[PDB]
Design a binder for this molecule. Structure first.
Ligand SMILES: [Cl-]
Length: 99
């Protein structure tokens, strides 16, 4: 639920940003908080090219233009996810992970 509030604030920021700007503001976040957020592009790559922890790729395929939001329990963790399209036209999936 901290994870859900992180998704919320992140999506709130990201929707007004382009790919390059969202990449740099993701990079500018502190390391301890990055372990909880991934932003996955149309190539199923994290915007900082980090390897995706398992579970991210159970949730990501579900996140769609028609059904943008979903939550999953995986490996004693809640993952929360949201598909958005940036002002670029590029689509990304912001995914956050708990404790
Ligand atoms: Cl959108």
């Amino acid at each position: 639920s901290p994870a859900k509030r992180l998704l919320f604030q992140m999506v709130g920021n990201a929707i007004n940003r382009n790919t390059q700007q969202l990449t740099q503001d993701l990079r500018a976040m502190p390391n301890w908080s990055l372990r909880f957020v991934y932003i996955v592009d149309r190539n199923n790559q994290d915007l900082l090219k980090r390897p995706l922890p398992p579970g991210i790729m159970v949730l990501a395929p579900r996140l769609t233009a028609k059904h943008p939001y979903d939550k999953v329990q995986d490996r004693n963790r809640k993952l929360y996810g949201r598909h958005i399209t940036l002002n670029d036209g590029n689509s990304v999936k912001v995914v956050t992970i708990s404790a």
